[PDB]
């Protein structure tokens, strides 16, 4: 970050700087970048978990333009407003992030079946949604949550929700927040540097889930990129106070 | 900072920079970006063996390609752009002694300085902006306008005052080292030789007077203020 104060050479008189209004209405200050990134962002709203797959994959990466919906493009399982959340807007300004992320997973159920959440460290790929690892046709005998990777379990009858913190298990110093084109086919090792691993959710029977993400406490962002080209058409969707 | 009355050689109040066996003078003032830090602590872990510096070769000023600015340039236009260190090894000033160590070491950490010298006349006017974008591979085409440039480390050049500008570039990369060269035997899974991008853009179009020149020139000079090499190998031609 370069403020540009270096280019402001005028030293003639100015009007007062006044007194800040921060804290006048309340002490709930909301300008800290880390504070903003620590409040949850909805990723998946009521998506399906199918036991015929290894599980539903969630790539470990913070919200940003990488998940932005564009009118006209193919329908994905990602909620459509991720790209306009304050935290995605902030992340679109920083290309580096290091630390843990926290996922709040809700299983829409009250059954006594355990649903497992398995953590996969950085392996090089970047996928999301239901997937049959190595394209097999049965996974209950070879469950990903029973292979040795760190796993946690949710039992809906006790609590249908859980909050898990995934570590920064990668070889790099920083994770790369975004690319100009999330679908470009370029050097494969670099392609996978935008995630630090995956979270895989596996059910016993078909059921739905919702997923939220936020920054952990041990988390930092950097490599400020400045603002991107933006657009807005808000004006058109509301009346002004003069009819 | 302060001019003097005219004498035999005009207003003799120039300032200058001497780095190794190279000197660069400036007729007016100079704008310099902040001296900022690079990641430290990973060097001793990413390389079991000692890393090296060759200051007399790398820390000298080396001019690169000339930049032409014309009255037809529009705001936001890219006048020039560099992927570093790559472009300073295989496209600009290729025979420079500053490139020597890159022929034998496979990895490196680089901190540079880039000086920009402009020469527009007193009846011309315009503004140019130079900025750096760290670890830009596959992210050059976004956050790439004059607005993003004004937010990142940058220097501004006025085309009629000819102030000089010095951009200080630390090493901020998502890995410990950047790879120096591609090679038929090296992996293609990792694009090497690029840890940052430098953009030279038009902020406000160059304008001239009646019958005046429709263009003027800018010249960039680079030097490493800290180039550390790791992983010795046999020497190879650059890119």
């Amino acid at each position: 970050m370069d403020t540009g104060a270096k280019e402001d050479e005028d030293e003639t008189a100015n009007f007062s700087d006044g007194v800040t209004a921060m804290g006048f209405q309340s002490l709930d200050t909301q300008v800290s970048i880390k504070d903003i990134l620590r409040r949850p962002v909805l990723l998946f709203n009521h998506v399906e978990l199918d036991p015929d797959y290894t599980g539903f994959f969630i790539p470990i990466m913070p919200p940003s333009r990488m998940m932005q919906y564009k009118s006209g493009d193919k329908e994905t399982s990602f909620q459509r407003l991720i790209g306009r959340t304050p935290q995605a807007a902030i992340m679109n300004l920083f290309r580096f992030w290091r630390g843990s992320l926290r996922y709040t997973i809700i299983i829409h159920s009250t059954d006594g079946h355990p649903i497992y959440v398995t953590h996969v460290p950085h392996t090089g790929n970047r996928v999301y949604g239901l997937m049959k690892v190595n394209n097999l046709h049965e996974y209950t005998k070879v469950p990903i949550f029973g292979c040795g990777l760190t796993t946690e379990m949710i039992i809906p009858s006790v609590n249908p929700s859980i909050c898990v913190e995934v570590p920064f298990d990668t070889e790099n110093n920083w994770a790369v927040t975004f690319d100009e084109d999330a679908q470009r086919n370029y050097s494969w090792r670099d392609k996978g540097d935008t995630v630090t691993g995956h979270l895989v959710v596996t059910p016993v029977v078909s059921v739905y889930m919702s997923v939220w993400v936020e920054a952990g406490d041990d988390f930092e962002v950097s490599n400020f990129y400045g603002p991107p080209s933006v657009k807005t058409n808000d004006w058109n969707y509301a009346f002004s106070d003069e009819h | 900072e302060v001019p003097s009355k005219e004498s035999i050689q005009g207003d003799a109040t120039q300032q200058s920079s001497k780095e190794e066996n190279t000197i660069i003078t400036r007729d007016q003032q100079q704008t310099v970006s902040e001296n900022i830090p690079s990641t430290v602590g990973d060097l001793v872990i990413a390389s079991s063996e000692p890393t090296q510096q060759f200051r007399s070769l790398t820390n000298r000023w080396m001019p690169i390609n000339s930049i032409r600015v014309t009255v037809n340039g529009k705001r936001n236009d890219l006048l020039a752009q560099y992927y570093i260190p790559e472009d300073f090894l295989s496209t600009h000033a290729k025979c420079a002694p500053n490139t020597i160590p890159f022929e034998t070491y496979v990895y490196g950490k680089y901190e540079l300085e880039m000086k920009f010298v402009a020469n527009g006349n007193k009846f011309q006017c315009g503004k140019v902006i130079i900025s750096v974008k760290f670890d830009s591979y596959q992210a050059d085409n976004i956050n790439t306008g004059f607005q993003a440039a004004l937010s990142r480390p940058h220097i501004m050049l006025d085309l009629s005052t000819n102030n000089e500008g010095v951009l200080k570039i630390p090493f901020r990369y998502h890995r410990a080292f950047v790879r120096n060269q591609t090679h038929k035997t090296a992996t293609a899974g990792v694009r090497p030789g690029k840890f940052a991008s430098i953009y030279v853009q038009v902020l406000s179009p160059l304008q001239t007077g009646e019958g005046g020149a429709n263009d003027m020139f800018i010249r960039p000079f680079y030097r490493y203020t800290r180039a550390e090499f790791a992983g010795m190998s046999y020497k190879v031609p650059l890119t």
């Binding site: 679908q183 086919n185 370029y186 050097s187 | 236009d77 890219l78 472009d87 596959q138 050059d140 085409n141």
Partner: peptide, 26 residues
């Protein structure tokens, strides 16, 4: 197929990214 996969040859370098020589990208 997917038009995002590869950049046209005239604007890119061997790494499938805009060439630093291609100034018109902005």
């Amino acid at each position: 197929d997917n038009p995002h996969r590869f950049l046209p040859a005239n604007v890119s370098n061997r790494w499938n990214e805009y060439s630093s020589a291609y100034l018109p990208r902005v």
